[PDB]
Ligand binder design. Structure first.
Ligand SMILES: NC(=O)C1=CN([C@@H]2O[C@H](COP(=O)(O)OP(=O)(O)OC[C@H]3O[C@@H](n4cnc5c(N)ncnc54)[C@H](O)[C@@H]3O)[C@@H](O)[C@H]2O)C=CC1
Ligand SMILES: Cc1cc2nc3c(=O)[nH]c(=O)nc-3n(C[C@H](O)[C@H](O)[C@H](O)COP(=O)(O)O)c2cc1C
Ligand code: SF4
Ligand code: SF4
Ligand code: SF4
Ligand code: SF4
Ligand code: SF4
Ligand code: FES
Ligand code: FES
Lengths: 120, 156, 225, 439, 139, 226
C-alpha cells in the first residue's frame, strides 16, 4: 500500500518507494526499489510491514557482476503469489473504500448510517 | 427545485417575531415545513436558511440533530411506539411484533403503499397507561397485540 | 534603508553548540536507494555554504536550541503540528527565543501633512467604461495560476456589468461581449453585478489576458460580439 | 380520597371527569389570588425571599433550592432583559407528572410563571415543552389566550405596570433538551448541546441575558406558597424537604398512577396503600425511585421515606419521585439493556465518554442477553460505570445512564454472570504468524 | 520494587564511607537506572577518591570502564552539575560484589583531567580512546 | 499564580487554564478538542488531571485541565493512577470505532491521535464489536475528506465557523453518528479552509495536493521559507 514503513524501518536506508493511487482509491507503489548491495538482510522491513507485502524468502543465490544490477526495481520484486503469508489481506481490514469493497464491507464494520435517517 | 409557499413564509416570519434572534425560529420553521409537506426536503434547508439569515449548515445540523424533524421521506401516517423501560416492563415487544406482522416492515421503514412508517420513540410520558404508541397526533394507550389491527384501520 | 536585513537571520557561521541546523528529520530514510536508479554510488551530500542549515539530518532541531528559524516542528512523542507547543516559550505565544524577522523601520517622530488632493465624484461618461478591479485569491497572483491544481479552483474569466448598463447595451447574463484595450479586442461572458455602480465594468485582475495594471483604466467600444 | 386545599395544594382542583380547568372555574376555586397578592402587595425581592424561606426545592429531580437559584441573578439594573423558562420537556422514562400538571391545570402553570417572572423581574417567559404533548400545548395556548384577554398577561398586569409575555415553544423530540443549558441552546435554535457551568444561566443564559430555568411542578408549587403563605407551606410535612411532591408507582401494579403526597412518605405506602401492590401472579423484585436515571433498590429499601437525603443515603436518588416497580418475570440484563439503549441513543454527541462508551455498554448487554458474553464484560461494565460518573463527562446525562447499570450489577450480579458463556476472542488466526499467547 | 526502578543507592556503604572521608558536600549522588551508585566527584579530588576506593577494607580493585560523554546537547540534566563534557570511571569491587560510577564534569574550554594510570594501568588505553574520540586531555 | 503539579511547585499565569499552563512548563497532558487559538470547550474529555483541595488531600477529583483555571495555590496531579487510567480509557473509547487505516492514511506519522494513543500507553484492544462507518464527501480540489477517522473533537467546526467565519461546514447528526462536513458535496468556500488539515488532529481533512504525491513527514526535507 506504499505506506513507507519498511523504508524508514531500514537501518541502512536501502528502500526507496513512491506512493501512487488508482481511480478507485487504492494505494500502491509507483516504484519500489531496493539497493541489495546495501541490504544487510536483517528482516526489519518484513517485521515492519503492516500488510505483509515485503518478505524475505529462502533464497541466497544473489551474486552479480555489476553493482548497478543489484538495484532491484518493482518488476524484479513483485511475485505472482502471497508467499509466506497465504491469506492476509490488509484491505479487508482497512476502512478506506476501494474497488470491490465499499464502506462498511470491511471486517468488524457496521453499515454506514446517514444523519438523515429516521431512526433515533 | 424547492420554493417556500406564502403560508409557510408568513408562519416562519410570525415565529421569528417571538424571539430576539431570528436563529431561534429554526426548529419551528423546520416543523412548519414538516407539517405542510410531511418531511423536510433538501431544498427546504436552504430556503429556511435564506429566510432566517443563518447558514444552511446550521439548519442542516438542527434538522439532523432532532429526531422528530424528518430529513427522509415518510408515509402518510407515522406510527411511533415507545420502547422505553416502563413499556418494556408492560410488554411493548408484543405490540412491536404485531405492528411488524401487520405492516410487513421493520422499524424505520415505510410500507409499499406509503401509508404507514414505523418508528421507535423515547418515553411518551404515559407510563402508567403503557404500552403507548403515538400515531400522527393521537397517543394510544393500554395497547394489546389484538387491538393493533383494529386500531391501524382507522388511519386511512 | 535596507540595512536592517542583516538581522533577519544569522549568517552561515551560526551554530548551535558547534553543529548546524537540520533540514530533514533524524529518521530520514532511503539515503542509499533514493538515487540508486541513476547510479548505485551515493553522491556527495550537498554543501550549503550560503546559510546555517545543512542538507542532511546531521544538524540541530532541538526545541530548546537558541535559534529563531525553525524548519519544522518535532518533539519525541509529538509528531503532529502540536510540537510547536514544545517549540514556544508559552503555548499560543511567541517562539522561545523570539520570532524571526526584523522591522526595517521604526515609527516616525513626526507625521505627514494632510493630502489636499480631494478627487471629484465619479461621472459615468458615454462611450467609456471605468475598469473596476476584481481580485481573486485563486487567480490574481502571477505564480499561483501556473499551479495546475488552481485551474479547477480559479473562476471562469467574466466581465462584471451593472444591470442598468447591461440593459442599456441589451446584453443578458452569460452572453459574450468584446472590448478593445490597447488595440486588442478580447471577448468575455457577462456576469450581472448588482453592487457595481453604473458606468463601470468589472474585470478580474491578474487572470489570463487581463493585467493588474488595467485597474482604473478606461475601456472603449465594449459591445456584444 | 378527599383532597382538601390545605394538604393538596396542587391536585385539589382537579376535575373528576379528567377535564381541563379553564379560567372561570380556576378563578372560582381560588385562582390568581397569590398572583394578585404578589403583584400588588409584595416586592420582587420579597417574593424571592418568601420562596427562599419556604424551602421550595427544585422538582426537576436535583432538589436545588428555587429561592437560592432566584437569588443569584445579577443585581445590576442595566440588565433589564430577563428570561424565565419552564422546563416542560419531561423526557425521562417513567416520568409523567408534568403531563398531568399541564394537561388539566394549565392556569396553575400560567399563574406560577407570572409570579416567578414578577419576582425575577423577567420580561419574557418561554415554556419549552416537548412536541409529543399535543393536548398540553393546546390547553396551554388556550389558557394563555384566556389570561391575556382577561388582563392576567400582556402589558400592565393588574395595573402595576409590569409587562410579561408568555410563549409556548414546542420541541422536536430529543431527550437532552431537558438539560437546562441544552434547553437554552435549543431555545436559541441551535443543536441542544449543554453548556459548561460556571457561568450559570442565571448570570448569562438565554441570548446572554439572565435566565432562570425551572420545572413545571416548581412553578406549580409557587402559587400555593404565594396564596397561603410561608408558614402554611413549612407546616405541611415535618421533614427537611418542605411541601408536597407528585409521587407514584408505575409498572405491573394494581393501580399505576400519580398522587400528590407530602415528603417523607415511605415508598411502601405508595406501592401498597396507593398503587395497590403488585399484580396477581407477580412478585416484587426491585424498584427505581426517580425514573430511568436512578439506581435500582431492593425490597429492603421499600421502607424508606421519599426524601432526597434518605434515598441519597441508600445509594440512589429521589429524582422525579416517580418510582417504577420491577417484578420477577423481568430479566435484569434485558431491562438494563433497554435503559442503556435509550441512554446511548439520546446522547447529544458532545463528549467522548457518554458518546463512545454508552454504545460499548449497549453492545456488551446485547451480548449478555443472548448468552454471547465473554470474560471481561462485567469488568468492562464496572469500569464504564466508574469512568462515566459525575465530573468525568460534560453533563449529567451519563452518570444517570450508568446508575442503573451499576446498581443492577451490585444487586443482581448472578443474572449478568449467566450471560458469559463463550470464551474471550478478539483476534482470529493469521496463517504464518504465531500469536503472542498471553497468560 | 522492580529491578528497573530508579535508585539513588544512598544506602550503599560506599556512599557513607565517602561522606565520612571527604564530607557531605564533596560530591553529588545521581539517581539512575544503572543499578550502581553514580557519584559526581570534583576534578581536583578525583585521584584522592580513587586512592580512597583502592585502600578500602574490601577495595575497588578493577577499573571496569573509563570514557567520556558530550553533555552539551543533553536537555534533561536535572540534579546534575553543570557540565559541557563528562568523564565516567566505572570501578568494580569483587569482594563486595559492588561497583561505583564516578563522574567528573568538565567545561568546554578546560578539557583536561588528571590521568588515572597511576591507580589503574588500563586507564592508558581508556584515556587514549577518550582523547581520540572526545578531545579530552589527560595530564 | 502558584501551582503544584505532582508535588513540584511552579509559577504560572493565573489567567491561563491548567492545560496551557502545564504544556508551557513542559509537562505532557494529552488533549484533542483544545487549541491555543480556539480556546477551551471541554469536549474530548482527554485532558483529565486530578485536583486536590489543599496540600494534604488523598482523594482528589478528576477535573478538566483545559476547563480549570490555573489559580494561585492550585494542587493537581498528572501521573495519578486514576487520571492515567481515565485518559487511557478516553483514548480507548475514541479507538473503538477508528478504522484500521494508518498505512493508507495521509495523517500517518503526523497524527495527533496516533501520538496521544501512544502517549497514554493504550496498545491492547479488548473491544470486539463493530465499528461505525461514514460515507465521504467531495470538498473540492484542496481538502480530502474521510469521516471514518473522526474522533468528534469539534475542532473543525469551531475553527471554520467561530474563528474563520465560514458558513458551509458544520456538525450534523446525533449521539455517535455526528458528521462533520458540508451540507452537500461541493468546494469549501472559505479562503482559510486549508488550515483544517492542521486543525484536524486526525486524517479526516487532508491536503489533497500533497496526497497526489504523498510522502511521510520523516521523509521530507524542510526549510523555513516565506
Ligand atoms: N425529566 C426529568 O425530570 C429529568 C430530571 N433529571 C434530574 O436532573 C438532575 C441533574 O440536573 P443538573 O442540572 O444536570 O444538575 P445540578 O444538580 O447541578 O443542577 C440543578 C439545578 O441547580 C442549579 N445550580 C446548581 N448549582 C448551582 C450553583 N452553584 N449556582 C447556581 N445554580 C446552581 C442549576 O442551575 C440547575 O437549575 C438529576 O438529579 C436528575 O434527577 C434528569 C433527567 C430527566
Ligand atoms: C440529561 C438531563 C435531562 C434533564 N431533563 C429534564 C427535563 O426533561 N425536565 C426538567 O424539568 N428537568 C430536566 N433536567 C434537570 C434540569 O437540568 C434542571 O435541573 C431543571 O430543568 C430545572 O431545575 P429545577 O429542578 O430547580 O426546576 C435534566 C437534567 C439532565 C442532566
Ligand atoms: S532486510 Fe535489508 S531492506 Fe530490509 S530492513 Fe534490513 S537492511 Fe533494510
Ligand atoms: S512493503 Fe509494506 S511496509 Fe513497505 S510501503 Fe509497502 S505496505 Fe508499507
Ligand atoms: S454526557 Fe456528553 S455527549 Fe452525553 S449528553 Fe451530556 S454532553 Fe452530550
Ligand atoms: S487519522 Fe491517525 S489514527 Fe486514524 S488512520 Fe490516520 S494516522 Fe491512523
Ligand atoms: S473532523 Fe477532525 S477536527 Fe473535526 S471533530 Fe473530527 S477529528 Fe476533530
Ligand atoms: S416508558 Fe413508555 S410511555 Fe414512558
Ligand atoms: S482538551 Fe480538555 S476536554 Fe478536550
Amino acid at each position: 500500500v506504499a505506506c513507507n514503513l519498511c523504508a524508514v524501518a531500514c537501518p541502512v536506508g536501502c528502500i526507496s518507494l513512491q506512493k501512487a493511487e488508482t481511480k478507485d482509491g487504492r494505494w500502491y507503489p509507483e516504484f519500489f526499489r531496493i539497493n541489495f548491495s546495501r541490504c544487510i538482510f536483517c528482516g526489519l522491513c518484513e517485521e515492519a510491514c503492516p500488510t505483509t507485502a515485503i518478505q524475505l524468502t529462502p533464497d541466497f543465490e544473489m551474486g552479480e557482476y555489476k553493482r548497478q544490477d543489484l538495484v532491484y526495481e518493482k518488476e524484479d520484486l513483485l511475485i505472482s503469489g502471497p508467499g509466506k503469508y497465504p491469506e492476509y489481506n490488509f484491505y479487508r481490514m482497512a476502512g478506506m473504500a476501494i474497488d470491490g469493497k465499499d464502506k462498511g464491507e470491511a471486517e468488524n464494520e457496521a453499515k454506514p448510517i446517514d444523519v438523515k435517517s429516521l431512526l433515533p | 427545485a424547492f420554493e417556500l409557499s406564502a403560508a409557510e413564509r408568513e408562519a416562519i416570519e410570525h415565529e421569528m417575531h417571538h424571539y430576539e434572534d431570528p436563529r431561534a425560529a429554526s426548529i419551528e420553521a423546520l416543523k412548519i415545513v414538516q407539517k405542510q409537506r410531511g418531511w423536510v426536503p433538501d431544498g427546504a434547508i436552504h430556503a429556511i436558511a435564506d429566510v432566517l439569515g443563518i447558514p444552511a449548515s446550521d439548519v442542516e445540523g438542527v434538522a439532523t440533530f432532532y429526531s422528530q424533524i424528518f430529513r427522509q421521506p415518510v408515509g402518510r401516517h407515522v406510527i411511533r411506539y415507545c420502547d422505553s423501560v416502563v413499556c418494556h416492563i408492560n410488554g411493548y415487544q408484543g405490540i412491536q411484533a404485531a405492528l411488524e406482522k401487520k405492516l410487513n416492515i421493520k422499524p424505520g421503514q415505510t410500507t409499499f403503499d406509503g401509508r404507514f412508517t414505523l418508528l421507535p420513540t423515547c418515553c411518551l410520558g404515559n407510563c402508567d397507561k403503557g404500552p403507548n404508541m403515538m400515531i400522527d397526533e393521537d397517543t394510544h394507550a393500554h395497547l394489546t397485540p389484538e387491538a393493533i389491527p383494529e386500531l391501524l384501520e382507522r388511519y386511512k | 534603508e535596507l540595512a536592517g536585513i542583516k538581522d533577519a537571520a544569522p549568517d552561515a557561521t551560526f551554530r548551535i553548540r558547534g553543529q548546524k541546523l537540520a533540514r530533514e528529520p533524524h529518521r530520514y530514510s532511503g539515503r542509499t536507494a533514493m538515487r540508486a536508479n541513476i547510479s548505485v554510488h551515493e553522491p556527495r551530500q550537498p554543501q550549503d555554504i550560503d546559510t546555517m542549515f545543512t542538507f542532511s539530518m546531521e544538524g540541530n532541531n532541538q526545541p530548546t536550541a537558541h535559534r529563531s528559524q525553525v524548519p519544522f516542528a518535532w518533539a519525541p512523542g509529538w509528531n503532529s503540528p502540536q510540537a510547536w507547543n514544545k517549540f514556544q516559550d508559552e503555548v499560543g505565544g511567541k517562539l522561545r527565543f523570539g520570532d524571526p524577522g526584523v522591522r526595517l523601520f521604526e515609527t516616525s517622530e513626526n507625521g505627514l501633512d494632510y493630502f489636499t488632493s480631494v478627487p471629484a465624484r465619479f461621472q459615468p461618461q458615454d462611450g467609456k467604461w471605468r475598469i473596476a478591479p476584481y481580485y481573486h485569491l485563486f487567480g490574481s497572483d502571477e505564480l499561483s495560476q501556473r499551479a495546475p491544481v488552481f485551474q479547477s479552483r480559479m473562476p471562469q474569466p467574466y466581465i462584471k456589468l451593472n444591470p442598468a448598463d447591461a440593459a442599456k447595451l441589451g446584453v443578458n447574463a452569460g452572453t459574450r461581449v468584446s472590448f478593445s484595450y490597447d488595440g486588442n479586442t478580447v471577448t468575455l461572458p457577462v456576469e450581472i453585478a448588482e453592487g457595481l455602480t453604473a458606468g463601470q465594468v468589472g474585470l478580474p485582475m491578474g487572470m489570463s489576458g487581463i493585467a493588474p495594471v488595467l485597474a482604473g483604466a478606461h475601456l472603449e467600444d465594449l459591445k456584444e460580439a | 380520597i378527599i383532597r382538601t386545599p390545605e394538604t393538596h395544594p396542587l391536585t385539589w382542583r382537579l376535575r373528576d371527569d379528567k377535564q381541563p380547568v379553564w379560567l372561570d372555574e380556576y378563578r372560582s376555586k381560588n385562582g390568581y389570588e397569590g398572583a394578585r397578592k404578589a403583584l400588588t402587595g409584595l416586592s420582587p425581592d420579597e417574593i424571592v425571599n418568601q420562596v427562599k424561606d419556604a424551602g421550595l426545592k427544585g422538582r426537576g429531580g436535583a432538589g436545588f433550592s428555587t429561592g437560592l437559584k432566584w437569588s443569584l441573578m445579577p443585581k445590576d439594573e442595566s440588565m433589564n432583559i430577563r428570561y424565565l423558562l419552564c422546563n416542560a420537556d419531561e423526557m425521562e422514562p417513567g416520568t409523567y407528572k408534568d403531563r398531568l400538571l399541564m394537561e388539566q391545570l394549565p392556569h396553575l402553570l400560567v399563574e406560577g410563571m407570572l409570579i416567578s417572572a414578577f419576582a425575577l423581574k423577567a420580561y419574557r417567559g418561554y415554556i419549552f415543552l416537548r412536541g409529543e404533548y399535543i393536548e398540553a400545548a393546546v390547553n396551554l395556548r388556550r389558557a394563555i389566550a384566556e389570561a391575556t384577554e382577561a388582563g392576567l398577561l400582556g402589558k400592565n398586569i393588574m395595573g402595576t405596570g409590569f409587562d410579561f409575555e408568555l410563549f409556548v415553544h414546542t420541541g422536536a423530540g430529543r431527550y437532552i433538551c431537558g438539560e437546562e443549558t441544552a434547553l437554552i441552546n435549543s431555545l436559541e435554535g441551535r443543536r441542544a448541546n449543554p453548556r459548561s457551568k460556571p457561568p450559570f444561566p442565571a448570570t448569562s443564559g438565554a441570548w446572554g441575558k439572565p435566565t432562570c430555568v425551572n420545572n413545571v411542578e416548581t412553578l406549580c408549587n409557587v402559587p400555593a406558597i404565594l396564596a397561603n403563605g410561608v408558614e402554611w407551606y413549612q407546616n405541611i410535612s415535618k421533614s427537611k424537604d418542605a411541601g408536597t411532591k407528585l409521587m407514584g408507582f408505575s409498572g405491573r401494579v394494581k393501580n399505576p398512577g400519580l398522587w400528590e403526597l407530602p415528603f417523607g412518605t415511605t415508598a411502601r405506602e405508595i406501592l401498597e396503600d396507593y398503587a395497590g401492590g403488585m399484580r396477581d401472579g407477580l412478585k416484587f423484585k426491585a424498584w427505581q425511585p426517580g425514573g430511568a436515571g436512578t439506581d435500582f433498590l431492593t425490597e429492603a429499601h421499600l421502607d424508606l421515606p421519599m426524601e432526597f437525603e434518605s434515598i441519597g443515603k441508600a445509594g440512589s436518588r429521589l429524582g422525579t419521585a416517580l418510582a417504577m416497580a420491577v417484578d420477577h418475570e423481568i430479566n435484569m440484563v434485558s431491562l438494563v439493556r433497554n435503559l442503556e439503549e435509550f441512554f446511548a441513543r439520546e446522547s447529544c454527541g458532545w463528549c467522548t465518554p457518554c458518546r463512545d462508551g454508552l454504545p460499548w455498554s449497549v453492545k456488551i448487554l446485547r451480548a449478555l442477553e443472548r448468552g454471547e458474553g465473554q470474560p471481561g464484560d462485567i469488568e468492562t461494565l464496572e469500569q464504564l460505570c466508574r469512568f462515566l460518573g459525575p465530573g468525568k463527562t460534560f453533563c449529567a446525562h451519563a452518570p444517570g445512564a450508568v446508575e442503573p447499570l451499576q446498581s443492577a450489577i451490585k444487586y443482581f450480579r448472578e443474572e449478568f454472570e449467566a450471560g458469559i458463556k463463550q470464551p474471550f476472542s478478539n483476534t482470529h488466526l493469521i496463517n504464518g504468524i504465531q500469536p503472542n499467547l498471553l497468560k | 520494587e522492580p529491578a528497573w526502578q530508579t535508585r539513588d543507592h544512598l544506602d550503599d556503604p560506599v556512599i557513607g564511607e565517602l561522606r565520612n572521608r571527604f564530607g557531605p558536600d564533596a560530591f553529588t549522588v545521581q539517581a539512575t537506572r544503572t543499578g550502581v551508585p553514580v557519584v559526581w566527584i570534583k576534578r581536583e579530588q578525583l585521584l584522592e577518591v580513587g586512592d580512597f576506593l583502592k585502600k578500602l577494607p574490601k577495595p575497588y580493585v578493577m577499573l571496569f570502564d573509563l570514557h567520556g560523554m558530550d553533555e552539551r546537547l543533553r536537555t534533561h540534566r536535572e540534579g546534575l552539575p553543570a557540565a559541557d563534557f563528562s568523564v565516567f570511571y566505572h570501578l568494580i569491587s569483587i569482594d563486595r560484589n559492588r561497583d561505583i560510577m564516578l563522574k567528573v564534569a568538565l567545561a568546554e574550554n578546560d578539557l583536561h583531567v588528571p590521568t588515572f594510570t597511576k591507580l589503574f594501568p588500563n586507564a592508558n588505553w581508556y584515556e587514549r580512546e577518550t582523547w581520540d574520540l572526545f578531545g579530552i586531555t589527560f595530564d | 499564580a502558584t501551582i503544584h503539579v505532582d508535588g513540584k511547585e511552579y509559577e504560572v499565569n493565573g489567567a491561563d487554564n491548567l492545560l496551557e499552563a502545564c504544556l508551557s512548563l513542559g509537562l505532557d497532558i494529552p488533549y484533542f478538542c483544545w487549541h491555543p487559538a480556539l480556546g477551551s470547550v471541554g469536549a474530548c474529555r482527554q485532558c483529565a488531571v486530578k485536583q486536590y483541595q489543599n496540600a494534604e488531600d488523598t482523594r482528589g477529583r478528576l477535573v478538566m485541565s483545559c476547563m480549570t483555571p490555573a489559580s494561585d495555590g492550585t494542587f493537581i496531579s498528572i501521573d495519578d493512577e486514576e487520571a492515567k487510567q481515565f485518559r487511557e480509557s478516553v483514548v480507548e473509547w475514541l479507538m473503538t470505532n477508528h478504522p484500521h487505516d494508518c498505512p493508507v492514511c495521509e495523517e500517518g506519522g503526523n497524527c495527533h491521535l496516533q501520538d496521544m494513543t501512544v502517549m497514554t500507553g493504550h496498545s491492547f484492544r479488548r473491544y470486539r464489536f463493530t465499528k461505525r462507518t461514514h460515507r465521504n464527501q467531495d470538498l473540492g480540489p484542496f481538502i480530502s475528506h474521510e469521516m471514518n477517522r473522526c474522533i468528534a473533537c469539534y475542532r473543525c467546526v469551531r475553527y471554520y465557523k467561530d474563528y474563520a467565519g465560514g458558513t458551509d461546514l458544520g456538525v450534523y447528526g446525533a449521539h455517535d453518528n455526528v458528521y462533520f462536513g458540508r451540507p452537500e458535496d461541493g468546494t469549501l468556500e472559505s479562503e482559510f479552509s486549508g488550515n483544517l488539515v492542521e486543525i484536524c488532529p486526525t486524517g479526516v481533512f487532508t491536503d489533497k495536493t500533497h496526497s497526489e504525491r504523498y510522502n511521510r513527514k520523516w521523509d521530507m526535507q524542510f526549510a523555513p521559507s516565506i
